[PDB]
Design a protein around this ligand. Structure first.
Ligand SMILES: [Mg+2]
Lengths: 126, 34, 216, 365
């Protein structure tokens, strides 16, 4: 198609089969289809643990630096990948979400202790 | 921890649609209950 | 080729449609009219968001304030209730030009210009004011101008340089050793060149879009 | 209060004015509005100048309305606004002048301080202190207490009306409070400082009874709560001032009454506008009442209270100082007339040149 307006973006293009996802990190005009015309492939992401228990990310850090220097935006999933790698700082919501998960497990642990205490009362009743 | 004055500034801005204020999160990841 | 032929109707349509737009431009009194019972704009039927309902009934528009002043309040200071609540430091506009909508039966719609002072820092040139049709404006009294505009700047405490990300820092130190540069200096990012304005900072009204004149 | 010389219209009536038939000029403006074309400021000026009868005022009132709702509303001239008030007084149409002044947003009549004194003084001499009070409230809404002469006349009307009005509604307290405060701030005399404490007291009443938004909404007043704190500061300032300044006893009684009343009372626009950390004004009244008694004791100990009523003190102030102001104001009035005369000639000359060029344009076309 002949797009009018838009910007270059670095995003994840979904590949693979059903229940077997695989991503191609690509630089593409934002208005193009998710799996359609792209400008350059900048790496790949396999989100499924392999035989060694490792999720494998490949980053063309030379071309990624090139396209960020030319105005390429970043999708939110790609910012999370760049943060985990160490190439970017950790994303604000990666930190906030981890804090929410800590607060949510703290409640669950306290409830289990209370239930055990309630179960202890049942033991006292015999 | 945010300053006490700034927490009140948000309570005025979003008066009527607020949630319980959260304190500092646990220092480590709480061990998963099993 | 040469079998591609002119499209006179297409050319005529484009030009003709343009003329209607120029002549039938809507006015601020019509585009930004509001129905306060339903909080919905009659021209387009657009319903205002929920977080704005209280202020639409409780606050005034800019030219409602200025229509009551001689010379439409040239030289007066005007602030916004949103700024008053968000920022402790003085934020206001110094009005320089005001073009009301004469069609409006109360001269309560129009455009304005002024010099911005945001969070105590003053701009050097006058530009058009954005969000003039918002129910957020508060005229500052003349006797309170001196106390309102009094500001003493605090020494800036936001860091000027920060470390590099963990991986990007290691790649820099590795390049140093490869190139023969021997040093234990820590790579540092400089944040002065790229410091971000607040999200509520007034934007450029001149380059902003205007709604179309087709009623819904 | 003002002298006959202040209200004499020999100078205005002797102004050089062009003779244009109102009917002819009326047609020109009517055609312009039909064609959605801008009307000149000189055109509306010529109409107001050539008003010759009570009926003509009615037609001119319509055209001033049309001018306000036109592309050249901003260019209404000061002398045109002054002539309107002068013509209204000349033909007995004072009600019309006050109507347009109150409906300024519709007609665009924003008079200068000299014109305000002319209209306000007419009502004062006729004894219509209800219309005179309306003029004072309009001066307050426009924040136009700059000239000293206007301040003296305004304070006399306010205090004279307040004495008659034993009962004040919340709107009246707000309007009276603002008018006293703004007029008082300009004056540094005992009457001026008494009106500042009087104004803050009334506004403090509305703040603690109906909320702070009743005080500042649509008023030339600040939105920060604590008007009773501003009143008490006036007492603390006078008490500790090295110079000997006095506060009228009448005002002190008003503040005592306000503190007692507030202390022991018997669609979606419902917002808490004050931060939770800040103390509400209602909780601070116990401390406020202690400061008042302490300040009152110190003031009486230092003999800084004036037993004389505020209406009597204001009358003396007006008699002593108003004569001098009349001379200064009248001197400035003569200068304004000459400045207006020159500017009017420039507009007439510029109009003649463009019309001559218009003929050349048609000749070329
Ligand atoms: Mg926005």
């Amino acid at each position: 198609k002949a797009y009018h307006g838009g910007h270059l973006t670095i995003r994840l293009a979904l590949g693979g089969c059903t229940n077997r996802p695989f991503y191609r990190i690509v630089a593409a005009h934002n208005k193009c289809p998710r799996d359609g015309r792209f400008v350059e492939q900048l790496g790949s992401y396999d989100p499924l643990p392999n035989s060694h228990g490792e999720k494998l990310v490949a980053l063309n850090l030379d071309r990624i630096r090139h396209w960020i220097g030319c105005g390429a935006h970043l999708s939110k999933p790609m910012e999370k990948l760049l943060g985990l790698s160490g190439f970017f700082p950790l994303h604000p919501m990666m930190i906030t979400n981890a804090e929410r998960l800590r607060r949510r497990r703290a409640r669950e642990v306290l409830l289990a202790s209370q239930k055990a205490e309630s179960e202890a009362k049942e033991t006292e009743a015999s | 921890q945010p300053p006490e004055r700034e927490l009140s500034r948000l309570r005025r801005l979003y008066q009527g649609n607020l949630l319980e204020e959260s304190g500092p999160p646990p220092e480590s990841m709480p061990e998963m209950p099993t | 080729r040469k079998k591609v032929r002119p499209r006179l109707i297409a050319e005529l349509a484009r030009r003709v449609r343009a003329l209607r737009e120029q002549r039938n431009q809507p006015r601020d009194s019509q585009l930004y009219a509001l129905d306060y019972e339903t909080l919905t704009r009659p021209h387009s039927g657009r319903r205002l968001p929920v977080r704005a309902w209280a202020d639409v009934r409780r606050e005034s528009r800019l030219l409602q304030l200025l229509a009551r002043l001689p010379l439409f309040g040239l030289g007066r200071l005007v602030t916004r209730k949103s700024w008053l609540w968000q920022h402790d430091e003085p934020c206001y506009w110094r009005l320089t030009r005001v073009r009301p909508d004469y069609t409006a039966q109360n001269l309560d719609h129009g455009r304005a210009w002024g010099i911005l002072t945001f969070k105590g820092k003053s701009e050097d040139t006058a530009r058009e004011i954005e969000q003039v049709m918002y129910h957020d404006w508060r005229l500052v009294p003349k006797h309170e101008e001196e106390a309102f505009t009094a500001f003493t700047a605090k020494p800036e405490d936001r860091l000027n340089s920060v470390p590099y990300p963990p991986l990007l820092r290691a790649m820099i130190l590795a390049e140093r050793q490869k190139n023969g540069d021997t040093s234990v200096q820590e790579p540092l990012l400089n944040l002065e060149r790229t410091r971000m304005r607040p999200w509520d900072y007034p934007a450029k009204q001149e380059t902003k879009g205007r709604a179309k004149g087709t009623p819904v | 209060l003002l002298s006959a010389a202040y209200v004499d219209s020999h100078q205005w009536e002797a102004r050089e004015k062009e003779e244009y038939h109102l009917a002819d000029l009326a047609s020109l403006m009517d055609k312009a509005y039909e064609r959605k074309l801008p009307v000149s400021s000189l055109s509306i000026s010529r109409f107001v100048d050539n008003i010759a009868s009570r009926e003509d005022l009615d037609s001119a009132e319509y055209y001033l309305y049309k001018f306000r709702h036109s592309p050249n509303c901003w260019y209404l001239r000061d002398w045109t606004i002054h002539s309107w008030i002068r013509q209204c007084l000349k033909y007995g149409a004072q009600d019309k002048a006050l109507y347009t002044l109150v409906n300024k947003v519709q007609y665009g009549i924003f008079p200068d301080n000299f014109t305000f004194n002319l209209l306000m003084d007419y009502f004062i001499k006729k004894g219509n202190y209800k219309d005179a009070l309306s003029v004072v409230f309009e001066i307050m809404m426009q924040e136009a207490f700059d000239v000293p002469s206007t301040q003296f006349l305004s304070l006399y009307v306010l205090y004279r009306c307040l004495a008659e009005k034993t009962e004040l509604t919340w709107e009246e307290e707000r309007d009276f409070g603002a008018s006293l405060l703004l007029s008082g701030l300009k004056q540094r005399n005992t009457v001026g400082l008494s009106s500042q404490l009087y104004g803050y007291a009334l506004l403090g009443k509305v703040e603690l009874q109906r909320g702070v938004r009743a005080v500042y909404h649509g008023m030339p007043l600040m939105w920060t709560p604590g008007y009773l704190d501003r009143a008490l500061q006036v007492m603390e300032r006078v008490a500790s001032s090295p110079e000997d300044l006095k506060l009228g006893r009448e005002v002190l009684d008003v503040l005592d009454g306000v503190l007692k009343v507030v202390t022991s009372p018997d669609g979606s626009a419902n917002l808490v506008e004050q931060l939770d950390t800040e103390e509400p004004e209602q909780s601070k009244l116990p401390r406020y009442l202690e400061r008042f008694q302490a300040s009152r004791s110190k003031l009486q100990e230092l003999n800084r209270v004036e037993s004389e009523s505020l209406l009597t003190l204001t009358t003396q102030l007006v008699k002593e100082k108003l004569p001098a102001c009349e001379a200064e104001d009248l001197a400035t009035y003569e200068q304004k007339l000459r400045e207006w005369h020159l500017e009017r000639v420039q507009l007439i000359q510029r109009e003649q040149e463009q019309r001559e060029k218009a003929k050349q344009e048609y000749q070329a076309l």
